[PDB]
């Protein structure tokens, strides 16, 4: 009968063993889930540090209004190890000195400059000229390891100039579409209010302009918990919470 | 969006120049390989003799 239970069929030793085992299961499940959370946060901090905080110039991003999936980022930069800046300044000054010094043994005497119409498939730089655009080597004088390293850092300064000029015009585009998106949001609110006043409440989403904020455009939005991603049963459990 | 896509094209335009540089790195790397592999093989031939 329903007044008779599997518990009744049990003997007291089995009852004590089953109860203590399940309560051990309960406490250990609780504590192991708690440490699961704990190492979750610890891993999150490690991820933030090593990826985000190590980067000097951070991974900001553009997404165009008509192309919600196409993304444009400013270029990566790590926080400098002090050799970076020490090199940069000391080398640029002594490299002007190297322009004027005219010392080492030159192999360029054998070769006379000529012209070729296209050479390789075309490449081109953008923005204002770099300093290194004025500060590159010759083609034959580079035949020693240290001069090759100095050429390496000259090309690195080229890297810096291109990344910067690109990213300043990139951020200027950021600011322009920022003021456009602010005014677009205000106009969208105005249009919604006008349409609701007229009685045309069923405004299609194609009339209001696309507010294409990709969450990775401001990547710290992608850090969060999106509780929409929580499982619906876990959401139902979470509803009963008072805070 | 016109500006955005033109900027995307200019990204390629800049990045094409980037390929030159690691090539120079490998140039210096190979010369460094050279200078000591020479002595290694030469002394190998020494003690074979």
């Amino acid at each position: 009968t329903p007044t008779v239970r599997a518990e009744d069929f049990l003997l007291p030793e089995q009852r004590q063993a089953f109860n203590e085992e399940c309560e051990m299961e309960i406490h250990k499940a609780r504590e192991d889930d708690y440490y699961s959370l704990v190492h979750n946060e610890f891993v999150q901090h490690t991820i933030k540090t090593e990826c985000w905080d190590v980067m000097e110039v951070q991974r900001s991003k553009i997404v165009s209004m008509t192309d919600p999936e196409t993304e444009v980022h400013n270029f990566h930069l790590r926080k400098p190890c002090a050799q970076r800046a020490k090199i940069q300044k000391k080398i640029k000054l002594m490299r002007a000195i190297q322009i004027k010094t005219e010392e080492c043994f030159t192999l360029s005497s054998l070769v006379k400059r000529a012209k070729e119409g296209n050479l390789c498939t075309e490449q081109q730089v953008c923005g204002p000229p770099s300093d290194v655009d004025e500060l590159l080597y010759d083609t034959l004088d580079v035949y020693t390891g240290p001069r090759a390293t100095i050429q390496l850092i000259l090309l690195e300064c080229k890297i810096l100039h291109e990344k910067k000029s690109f990213n300043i015009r990139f951020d200027t585009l950021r600011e322009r579409k920022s003021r456009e998106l602010n005014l677009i949001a205000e106009r969208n609110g105005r249009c919604v209010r006008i349409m609701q006043q007229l009685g045309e409440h069923t405004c299609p989403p194609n009339v209001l302009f696309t507010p294409v904020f990709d969450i990775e455009e401001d990547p710290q939005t992608v850090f969060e918990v999106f509780d929409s991603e929580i499982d619906p049963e876990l959401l139902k459990l979470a509803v009963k919470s008072d805070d | 969006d016109d500006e955005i896509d033109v900027l995307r094209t200019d990204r390629m335009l800049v990045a094409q120049l980037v390929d030159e540089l690691e090539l120079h790195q490998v140039n210096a790397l190979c010369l460094f390989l050279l200078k000591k592999t020479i002595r290694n093989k030469f002394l190998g031939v020494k003690r074979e003799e």
């Binding site: 580079v142 035949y143 | 190979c30 010369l31 050279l34 020479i38």
Partner: peptide
């Protein structure tokens, strides 16, 4: 080959 190979990576660089 030692001598000429030194010279060849000197010239070809």
């Amino acid at each position: 080959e030692v001598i000429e190979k030194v010279l060849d990576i000197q010239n070809l660089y």
